[PDB]
Design a protein around this ligand. Structure first.
Ligand SMILES: [Cl-]
Ligand SMILES: [Mg+2]
Ligand SMILES: [Mg+2]
Length: 225
């Protein structure tokens, strides 16, 4: 009985609200390439949600047979940031305004649940989506001990919203994020907005898979009944 119970829709940020993942992927792929290391564009999408350190160490361990130092991690992350910021500013994901407007018109409360602490994207939420969100109904990197795929960010969103899990749905693009929503016990919709096989998102625990935000918006009525 989803129409009766649903109160809130918990949106991830990168790859759901903002179309920033082509730029994060390119920056990771290219920084590693300049260091002579192979991290494909598609693989960078797999690691969406991991810390810079964890991502870097995955590549360092498999290619060089060793961990990166803290000095190597800090410098590669700086390099990645320089590259990312040299690209155009990320636009709103097509379909994101539309789905937000649709759920708002149904009396649902949008929330943001992001692993970002990147204040360059975080500050842009209010003014890219005016009236959609409330600062008190947002979860960012600043609010949590463990990021996705740990369920903590989604469990914290339920707490901030005064919600039970059966009163929310999660909208996620990334396998680690889908895993977090599922492990939080919330009905989780995957939107496959990048180059990954959609099966990866189903295997991470998504209850439904859609190929894009606009497709989900177009199908929202069919879900709810
Ligand atoms: Cl590639
Ligand atoms: Mg994401
Ligand atoms: Mg797609």
């Amino acid at each position: 009985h989803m129409r009766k119970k649903l109160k809130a829709v918990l949106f991830d940020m990168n790859g759901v609200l903002f179309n920033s993942m082509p730029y994060h992927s390119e920056a990771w792929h290219q920084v590693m390439k300049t260091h002579g290391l192979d991290l494909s564009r598609e693989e960078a999408y797999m690691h969406e949600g991991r810390t810079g350190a964890s991502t870097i160490n995955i590549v360092f361990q498999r290619e060089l047979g060793k961990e990166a130092t803290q000095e190597e991690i800090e410098s590669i992350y700086h390099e990645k940031s320089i590259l990312f910021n040299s690209y155009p500013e990320a636009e709103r994901m097509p379909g994101a305004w539309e789905l937000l407007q649709k759920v708002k018109s149904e009396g649902l409360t949008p929330m943001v649940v992001t692993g970002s602490g990147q204040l360059s994207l975080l500050e842009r939420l209010e003014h890219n989506f005016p009236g959609m969100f409330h600062k008190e109904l947002m979860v960012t990197a600043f609010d949590v001990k463990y990021g996705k795929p740990n369920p903590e960010p989604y469990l914290m969103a339920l707490k901030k919203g005064g919600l039970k899990a059966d009163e929310a749905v999660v909208i996620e693009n990334a396998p680690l994020g889908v895993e977090a929503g599922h492990k939080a016990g919330i009905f989780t919709i995957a939107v496959n907005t990048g180059p990954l096989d959609g099966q990866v998102l189903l295997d991470a625990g998504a209850d439904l898979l859609f190929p894009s935000m606009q497709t989900l918006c177009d199908s929202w009525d069919t879900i709810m009944l």
